[PDB]
Structures are given as structure tokens and as C-alpha cells.
């Protein structure tokens, strides 16, 4: 049991499926050819599963305690793309 911090990679397991949220790297690419899609994958290994936390609010900073109900922005480790 670890205490979450800003700017620290986190791995999410979907409660029902048991799979892990990630960037698929395969994109329908409509409108934005550049962006990828986001979906579940079974395997834990890989930089796709991990997402980097960042403080959306200006008051919070890197390494700060994570609030219970603060707004948040997450960046994919694999391609440095936000969950958008």
C-alpha cells in the first residue's frame, strides 16, 4: 500500500474485466491522424499500460500529495499523449 504522488507513473486495472487501461497505438485516425486510441489490454508488461500523473491545478506541484478530489491530467508513457 503506497501513497500516490504527482508526477508518478500509475497502472490501472479495470475492476470488471481485470484488464489494464492503455493506449492501443492503433487509431481510427478520423479528424486527427496523429492521435492514437485508448483501450484495454491483458498484459501488464509494456510502457503502454503505465500513465504519468500531472497536476492540472497550478497550486499543486511535482512530488506533492495527491488530493482526494482534485482535477487531474494523465499522460500516456508510451507516446506522451494525454488521455483526451
Amino acid at each position: 500500500h503506497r501513497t500516490l504522488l504527482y508526477g508518478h507513473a500509475i497502472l490501472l486495472r479495470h475492476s470488471y474485466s481485470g484488464m489494464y487501461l492503455c493506449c492501443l497505438s492503433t487509431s481510427r485516425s478520423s479528424t486527427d491522424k496523429l492521435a492514437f486510441d485508448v483501450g484495454l489490454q491483458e498484459d501488464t508488461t509494456g510502457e503502454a499500460c503505465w500513465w504519468t500523473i500531472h497536476p492540472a491545478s497550478k497550486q499543486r506541484s511535482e512530488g506533492e500529495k495527491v488530493r482526494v478530489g482534485d482535477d487531474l491530467i494523465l499522460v500516456s508513457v508510451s507516446s506522451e499523449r494525454y488521455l483526451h
Partner: protein, 48 residues
């Protein structure tokens, strides 16, 4: 190096290969001999 691999993959996603191939396939306009014999030279600052 994973960082270099990620950067190259990002650039590949940015720029499609087919567009580069097509731009290379584009052909320049051609200098030609005129009737009087001089060479009409297209202004390159206004062209491909």
C-alpha cells in the same frame, strides 16, 4: 534506447510515408528553348 524509439515512432505517426513519396513524385517545371533561341527560365523564387 526506448526514448529514441518512441521519438522515431512519434515522427512516423506525424508524417505519413505516402505523402513524402508523392511530394518526391511531383515533377518540376522545365526550362525550354524558345523560337528566337534563348532559354526562358522560370522564376524559381515563385515555383517548386
Amino acid at each position: 534506447k526506448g526514448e529514441a524509439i518512441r521519438i522515431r515512432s512519434i515522427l512516423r505517426s506525424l508524417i505519413p510515408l505516402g505523402d513524402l513519396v508523392g511530394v518526391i513524385s511531383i515533377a518540376f517545371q522545365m526550362p525550354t528553348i524558345a523560337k528566337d533561341g534563348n532559354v526562358v527560365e522560370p522564376d524559381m523564387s515563385a515555383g517548386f
